[PDB]
Design a protein around this nucleic acid. Structure first.
Lengths: 56, 209, 122, 114, 120
RNA sequence: AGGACCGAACCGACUAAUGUUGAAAAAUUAGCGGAUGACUUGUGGCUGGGGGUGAAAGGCCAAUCAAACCGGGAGAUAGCU
RNA sequence: ACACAGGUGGUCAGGUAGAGAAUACCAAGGCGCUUGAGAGAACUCGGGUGAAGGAACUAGGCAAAAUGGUGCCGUAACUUC
RNA sequence: AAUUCCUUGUCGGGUAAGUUCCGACCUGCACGAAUGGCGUAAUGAUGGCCAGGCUGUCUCCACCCGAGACUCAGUGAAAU
RNA sequence: CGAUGUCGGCUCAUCACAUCCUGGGGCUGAAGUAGGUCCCAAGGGUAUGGCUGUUCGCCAUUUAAAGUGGUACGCGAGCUGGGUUUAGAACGUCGUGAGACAGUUCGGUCCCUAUCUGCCGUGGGCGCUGGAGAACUGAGGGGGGCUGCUCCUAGUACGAGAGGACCGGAGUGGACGCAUCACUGGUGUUCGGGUUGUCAUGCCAAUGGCACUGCCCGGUAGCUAAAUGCGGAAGAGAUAAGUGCUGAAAGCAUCUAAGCACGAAACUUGCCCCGAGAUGAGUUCUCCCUGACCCUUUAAGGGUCCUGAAGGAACGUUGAAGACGACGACGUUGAUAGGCCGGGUGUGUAAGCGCAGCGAUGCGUUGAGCUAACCGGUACUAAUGAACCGUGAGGCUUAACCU
């Protein structure tokens, strides 16, 4: 009751075809600044949705 | 004769003088809009689309808004379709109500059972639990023996194991119309029906001469 | 609930505190007995003032349940003991002259009214 | 939708007695038995809260001869002649399950009378 | 399972989550913005909003409460004096949540929780 | 007074369960039990291969044992493989 | 073999409660871990809840639950008294 | 019967029934006085048979709590 | 024989038909009811209690039956492990004896990191071809299938009588199966209250943590069965055995040959659910798009710019939807999740103040105080412009119509 003969490398390619990670393109920008973020978090500059959320 | 849709308000016991206590299920019936009627080249038959709410006018798309424009776009809570045969007069010009049941006594309801998808052999397939003491090794929750040895070489179709439960269409037929109100658009029926309190019920009349 | 191998007190006059339920009857597979319906009993103690023998096999009917009588409205009428009364297997009818039980509506739904009605309790 | 509560208040009564658990309620009924009305009386203490509208149970228990002898009446029931509350109880629990396994001075309820 | 339980069982035993979120309530009122995981930022809102509602009334009988689980020497004058007009007098909505992104080097979602009003 | 009744420290194997490619060269969790004795124990010794030790199972003798382990005669012999 | 749920000699054991070295909050004292985040389904392991019935279960009340402290009362057969 | 096929002998008792239990019997294919005989109490990590309480062992499980089943990141196997 | 787990116990299958029961009816020493016997038929069905290692057997009570067989006389990469079939013990026998025994009992292990074929839920492609959206066809598969009790016809048929039936005409049950939580129970470690040990806010009160949710006593919302509601349909088509019409081979005769008609719990629909990958890739409706340039040179192929509809995707708030995915509600054209407000269910009259009583404790202010899920109210907190994918009327033909 063990694997006998090796599975095909096309079948290995097809089982690996089900990937869903994205290249995140395009990234979103703030309504007052062209700085990039994912569609629901803050920028690393304190800008967010044209509101400004973290001071310096 | 077609069908109608309304919400399962709940169930309450109505009591009787000689017994039994009798549960009655209450159905809150909507203005079933009659958004469509199928006719020209539609497989030689006719069928009506009901619609059960107005949803939101902000959320609409042009392929839905044009397809419904013949009655205005509303398309809320569920569309649903019923076969129109032996109906004598055309359904368009008024929204259908509990007037469908003003003479009828019996109905069939497609309850749509509340989901219990997690299942299991004791929950779905009615099997026991095996030996909590005296001795048993990893065979305490099982549908017994799933197939006989050697000669079959394979597993049979239609075994009492796995799958999902609830969320079936589940019809019920042993019902009775207790009250109708065409002004309130309200229906009361005797007995219990599948589907949770606050879920939508499909009903059609049952007749035999 | 009353079932196979249950020991009970008996509603028959000069009957002992101990009679054994050997079958719940109904011909089909059955879990528990039911009010106003028959059950198979053996006498586990006999009292000399009584009209039964120890170890004898007899027919009985359930006359009070701790589960109560409750079908028509769900309103329960309840009792503080489980008991049956003894029936003859050929001549029919309750074999005693007095019954110790509430003698409810489902017992007068049987052919027995003449020998149970000395003391109605509800 | 609340229209099903308006449907329970359809069969409820316009006015009904209150007693609260442990009171001595001295009850009369016409029973009807689906066939024939007749006067019957039952006396004990009320061992449960009324309470949930039309499906109020109104459970009364006789508590005598070392037996409880429990009965459900329903406070809105159409077969009730009268409820004649004549004594208070001296109790603090509403479920009163300790009275199901006790007798006499251990299941006494008392009078309050305060 | 869980058919009316809307409480998140989150991670580790209930007695940890109790101790931790009762401590985090003291940490939140001290600095008025705190950073943690998105699940922890939302689970800190539970029973702390009722605790803010509890801090509104300045009566000597209500001053007996808000004291069983979270204590600090520097809130003793704000209690039953400021937490009312600043927060609890709003009648609900005493906080804000916002996801700040992911955790350093790993896929954990990170957020900040703040009070609905900042001192002037 | 006690080859005494229960019982900490101390000891310890009987049932049950978990563990069983483990944390594990035999443990873990719960209970019943041994506890002035024909007992137990800290520290160092003494008993060896057909010999030891055993209120005695051919059990135990450093995981091994109807005869331990290592190194030699030994690349012994195999009408067989 | 390991920063391994294990093995391992001698000395010490306060307060409140309690017969007490049982046992808890504690004292003085110590640690918050050498993967973390989260989730949550059939099922796997232990613990918790238990209606009405109860030893029917099982080879077996195994296992589990109930009993449980000690002052005053009250006690069979058999017996090496 | 720690000795006995057919045998659950044959009879009595317990039991709805009882190859088990308790008590007798002789016709022990083959017990027997130190390779001992027979009996008696507390007692037995002893075995068989019943009664009562208590009870999720069971009718029949139903729902919880703490830990695994899942998933993502870090570090990433074995037998075959 | 480099190693197919055996008997019995539990738990659970598949095929036969030599039919126990269920439907059909023939022959008879069949009037009738029955009994005896025969064969069309495997679609549904075919207990429970005691004794033993246990089948085999026996006994008591139930039954429409208490059918037989194949599958290693079916289910140890199944559960159990008492017998048989391990080391040790203990009895009877044979032998000079080690041993031996158609003589027998006590204690005696049951392993498994699931690869492949299979099975059961669920994602993602390719496809019907210009792209999208909403929904529905039915070639075909599955599910379903028996039965107990009672009453009318009727004391009808047959028969002095005794006795007592088909035919169709209803009601009511169980195992078993399904659904809901409304009743009745249960549980319900986000909750109300009492209490023993103790610690903590100086101490006391009031109050909280721990001691198994310390001990509990209880329980809303929810879920659940032991609760309640319901369930295996009516109808249509076509057959086998079997009964027949009309009739030739056999001038008679004959269910058959030509030609016609009926019939079973079987068979196929209807019922209930799936179902175009039905590649044999179904069908209607709706939405949208009317741009140019270059190269080899060409009805083929490649490249460039311009800037893009319909729709999807992204993102929340989170769900009655989940292991991951897939899917619902909606997102200020805002009640999607929560808090807050008015109240429910469920607990139980507290605190603070005083009074009666050496006091425990009780009394008044007080139906106190307390709240989550249920009901209603409320923008108080939170919920991006829209980027991105998607583009420009889409190859050939048979036949008709419009131009």
């Amino acid at each position: 009751a063990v694997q006998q003969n090796k599975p095909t490398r096309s079948k290995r390619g097809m089982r690996r075809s089900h990937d869903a990670l994205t290249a995140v393109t395009s990234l979103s920008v703030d309504k007052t600044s062209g700085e990039k973020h994912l569609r629901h978090h803050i920028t690393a500059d304190g800008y967010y949705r044209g509101r400004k959320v973290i001071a310096k | 004769m077609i069908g109608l849709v309304g919400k399962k308000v709940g169930m309450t016991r109505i009591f009787t003088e000689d017994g039994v206590s009798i549960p009655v299920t209450v159905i809150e019936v909507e203005a079933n809009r009659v958004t469509q009627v199928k006719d020209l080249a539609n497989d030689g038959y006719r069928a009506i689309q009901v619609t059960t709410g107005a949803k939101k006018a902000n959320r609409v798309t042009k392929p839905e808004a044009g397809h419904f424009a013949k009655a205005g776009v509303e398309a809320g809570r569920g569309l649903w379709e019923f076969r129109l045969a032996e109906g004598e007069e055309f359904t368009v010009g008024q929204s259908i109500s509990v007037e469908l049941f003003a003479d009828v006594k019996k109905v069939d309801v497609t309850g749509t059972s509340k989901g219990k998808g997690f299942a299991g052999t004791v929950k779905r397939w009615n099997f026991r639990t095996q030996d909590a003491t005296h001795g048993n090794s990893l065979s305490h929750r099982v549908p017994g023996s799933i197939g006989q040895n050697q000669t079959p070489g394979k597993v049979f179709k239609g075994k009492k194991m796995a799958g999902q439960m609830g969320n079936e269409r589940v019809t019920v037929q042993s019902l009775d119309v207790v009250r109708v109100d065409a002004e309130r658009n309200l229906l009361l029926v005797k007995g219990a029906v599948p589907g949770a309190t606050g879920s939508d019920l499909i009903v059609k009349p049952a007749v035999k001469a | 609930m009353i079932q196979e191998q249950t020991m009970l007190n008996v509603a028959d006059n000069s009957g002992a505190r101990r009679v054994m339920c050997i079958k719940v009857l109904g011909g089909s597979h059955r879990r528990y007995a039911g009010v106003g319906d028959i059950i198979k009993i053996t006498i586990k103690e006999a009292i000399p003032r009584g009209k039964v023998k120890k170890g004898d096999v007899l027919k009985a009917v359930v006359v009070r349940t701790k589960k109560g009588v409750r079908r028509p409205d769900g309103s329960v009428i309840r009792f503080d003991g489980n008991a049956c009364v003894l029936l003859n297997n050929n001549s029919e009818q309750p074999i005693g002259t007095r019954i110790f039980g509430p003698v409810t509506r489902e017992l007068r739904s049987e052919k027995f009214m003449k020998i149970i009605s000395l003391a109605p309790e509800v | 939708s609340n229209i099903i509560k308006q449907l329970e208040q359809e069969q409820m009564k316009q006015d009904v007695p209150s007693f609260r658990p442990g009171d001595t309620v001295e009850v009369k009924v016409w029973v009807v038995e689906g066939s024939k009305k007749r006067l019957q009386a039952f006396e004990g203490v009320v061992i449960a809260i009324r309470n949930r509208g039309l499906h109020s149970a109104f459970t009364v228990r006789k508590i005598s001869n070392g037996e409880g002898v429990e009965r459900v009446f329903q406070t809105h029931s159409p077969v009730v002649d009268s409820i004649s509350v004549k004594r208070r109880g001296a109790v603090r629990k509403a479920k009163l399950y300790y009275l199901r396994e006790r007798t006499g001075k251990a299941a006494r309820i008392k009078e309050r009378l305060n | 399972m869980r058919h009316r339980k809307s409480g998140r069982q989150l991670n580790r035993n209930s007695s940890h989550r109790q101790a931790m979120f009762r401590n985090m309530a003291g940490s939140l009122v001290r600095h008025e913005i705190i950073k943690t995981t998105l699940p922890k930022a939302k689970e800190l809102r539970r029973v702390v909003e009722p605790l803010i509602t509890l801090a509104k009334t300045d009566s000597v009988a209500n001053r007996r409460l808000a004291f069983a689980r979270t204590r600090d020497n520097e809130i003793v004058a704000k209690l039953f004096n400021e937490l009312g007009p600043r927060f609890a007098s709003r009648a609900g909505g005493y906080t804000r949540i916002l996801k700040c992104g992911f955790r350093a080097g790993d896929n954990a979602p990170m957020a900040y929780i703040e009070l609905v009003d900042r001192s002037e």
